[PDB]
Design a protein around this ligand. Structure first.
Ligand SMILES: CC/C(=C\C=C\C(O)(C(F)(F)F)C(F)(F)F)c1cccc(CCc2ccc(CO)c(CO)c2)c1
Ligand SMILES: CC/C(=C\C=C\C(O)(C(F)(F)F)C(F)(F)F)c1cccc(CCc2ccc(CO)c(CO)c2)c1
Lengths: 239, 10, 239, 10
């Protein structure tokens, strides 16, 4: 068939929200504490992630229906999907050639090794890169990529959610648009949608593992003092 | 108390 | 008369502790979030101060008698004198010519205006610079400068102190050495000591004013999120 | 609770 004027307006909003919260030049990276190749990359990586949280928030506030939720559910949804949304949007800078995130010169070109110097292990970075590669191979349209992030964020299956019935509705409305768009606008995507919903499941595993490695990291005050107030709040358990 | 998240979400 | 072998050992320890916690090249400043001329200098200034707190701590742990105090008194003494110790040690980089702190190229050369872009006002920066100038004019020997910091830090008149009787003793032992040294080793310092004890009083006023301007700054989460975990802990009231 | 100050003072 063909998209409706409502589904289409949702797409215009999400794509504009993304454009407004994602700089393809990565020009703000110079304001982060400089990178350094005991966890010498932590200071820079913490600033980069803290920066991203702010962007994910600005993007979220523009997801249709999200801003009507209660402050608490918004907090609950951000806190639990934050790291997953960062992993998804970061794919835009991932390169299948050098298997790394290229956000600028040799300095802002993050290799698997660099993240290790932030306090993480291969037990996470492995499935992560494997996720990036697989996700990249889907050559998602900008419209599908932005929809995937709005769906991941509106997952009602998050610890701390209250109105897990309205959230469930919002996500479905979005899931509808994504499926319609793939059918109407993406030649060869008979199995796409399915492959995308699968990616959400991979994120939960990555999210889980990250929470563990992050927990260990936050209990050590010599490392914890390197994080930012926002990162500590978002990934903290003091809810 | 999510002092910062509230401020950013407003 | 002449210094004793005990007073002399105190001086060797403090001067060595200072040398070990104060880099005259200011080479670590490149690791701070870059400076930028709503409070654009806050990120850099917060990192610089956070860095300094760590140095003041390392210096303090080497002050004779300090490490025997209770963890609580150490915390209590650091928290209340921190900003004063930073103001004193920063004098080593202050220049009477350009009335500014020169820690490197044009970038790391802090002008009165820059601190304003960190959220502070002339009501503080004025007495501050006036303090720096006056302090600089005393051409203190390295031995007297380091003693002044060890005395300021061991001020028993601090909110939160318990054994305010042992602290009072330690400070006196130090006050003795400073007075002896000026008499025996500093030609023309008949009024020095007195001028130095006076500087401590100026610090209390600067400290007081800073606490206010800092309080206002910490209540605004858009600014508070720019500070570091250590700065928030040291200047926080959550004791 | 001065989590960081304790760690640095040890
Ligand atoms: C292993 C997962 C991780 C970060 C982990 C960070 C922390 O745990 C810590 F402590 F280590 F700093 C934190 F901050 F959360 F606490 C991570 C996830 C995905 C990618 C990258 C690489 C870099 C990149 C990130 C984000 C964007 C854009 O947001 C772009 C540019 O597209 C590139 C790293
Ligand atoms: C107005 C007082 C102040 C800092 C205030 C900072 C904050 O309130 C905030 F939020 F604004 F960032 C903080 F961090 F405390 F919360 C200040 C005091 C004395 C000097 C300077 C100028 C720079 C300089 C500092 C320290 C050293 C060495 O420690 C050297 C090199 O000698 C140079 C600034």
């Amino acid at each position: 068939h063909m998209l409706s004027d409502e589904q289409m307006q949702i797409i215009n909003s999400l794509v504009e929200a993304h454009h407004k919260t994602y700089d393809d030049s990565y020009s703000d990276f110079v304001r982060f504490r400089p990178p350094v190749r005991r966890l010498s990359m932590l200071p820079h990586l913490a600033d980069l992630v803290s920066y991203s949280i702010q962007k994910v928030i600005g993007f979220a506030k523009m997801i249709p229906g999200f801003r009507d939720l209660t402050a608490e559910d918004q907090i609950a949804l951000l806190k639990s999907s934050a790291i997953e949304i960062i992993m998804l949007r970061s794919n835009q800078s991932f390169s299948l050639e050098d298997m790394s995130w290229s956000c600028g010169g040799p300095d802002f070109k993050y290799c698997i090794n660099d993240v290790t110097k932030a306090g993480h292990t291969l037990e996470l970075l492995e499935p992560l890169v494997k996720f990036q590669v697989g996700l990249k191979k889907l050559k998602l349209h900008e419209e599908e990529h932005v929809l995937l992030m709005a769906i991941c964020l509106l997952s009602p299956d998050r610890p701390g959610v209250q109105d897990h019935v309205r959230i469930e509705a919002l996500q479905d409305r979005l899931c509808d648009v994504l499926q319609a768009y793939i059918r109407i606008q993406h030649p060869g995507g008979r199995l796409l949608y399915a492959k995308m919903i699968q990616k959400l499941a991979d994120l939960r595993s990555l999210n889980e593992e990250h929470s563990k490695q992050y927990r260990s990291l936050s209990f050590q005050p010599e490392h914890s003092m390197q994080l930012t107030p926002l990162v500590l709040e978002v990934f903290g358990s003091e809810v | 108390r999510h002092k910062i998240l509230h401020r950013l979400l407003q």
